[PDB]
């Protein structure tokens, strides 16, 4: 009747994959249908900084920040899945929200 997407983001690949695997296993145990964690574009923020204070501009250093994002789509909204959803433990660096 209703399908739910969950956006699922982290810098770390290990933690994000472990969270996805745990959630998929829990859904399989509960008895609900999910498409799977389809990949999404990885956002990258790029910055430049000056290595030396007080002159010598030509020497600089670049910084990055990478955020890997994915979606997990669940069909057939089994009530037990909704009951057991928010109690699932997640890694510190992984953030998941509903849509």
């Amino acid at each position: 009747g209703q399908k739910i997407r969950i956006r699922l983001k982290a810098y770390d690949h290990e933690a994000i994959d472990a969270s996805a695997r745990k959630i998929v296993e829990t859904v399989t145990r509960t008895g609900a249908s999910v498409v799977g964690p389809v990949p999404l574009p990885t956002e990258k923020n790029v910055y430049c900084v000056i290595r030396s204070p007080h002159k010598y501009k030509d020497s600089r250093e670049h910084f990055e920040m990478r955020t890997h994002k994915r979606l997990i789509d669940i069909l057939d909204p089994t009530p037990k899945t909704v009951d057991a959803l928010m109690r699932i433990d997640l890694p510190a660096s992984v953030d998941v929200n509903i849509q």
Binding site: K57, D58, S59, R60
Partner: protein, 126 residues
Amino acid sequence: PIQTVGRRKEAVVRVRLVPGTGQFNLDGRTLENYFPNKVHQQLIKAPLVTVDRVDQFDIYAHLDGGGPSGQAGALRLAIARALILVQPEDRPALKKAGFLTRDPRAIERKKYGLKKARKAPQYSKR
């Protein structure tokens, strides 16, 4: 079904083939309406002319990335590989002219502290 992919310095093309008449479709335009270059014309003719079976295939191209020459080269390579696939006997021909050698040349990074790539600011002795 047959589908082939070509790439040339950030231009990506996908080509589908039909054994139909001697005409081409480039996202809804013919070979003269789109890529209106004689040089590009011979470049795209080079595979078929080398294999000597012009006017035997109708192509349909979907294009992205790059500019005129990049997409022209990408289409050339894609159709060359497609022809090699459908008729492998012509494999020892294009390699003689080196049409199977994909071109690994791209844009070099602009390096900080300079003007661009390898260009450098003017140097004064005083």
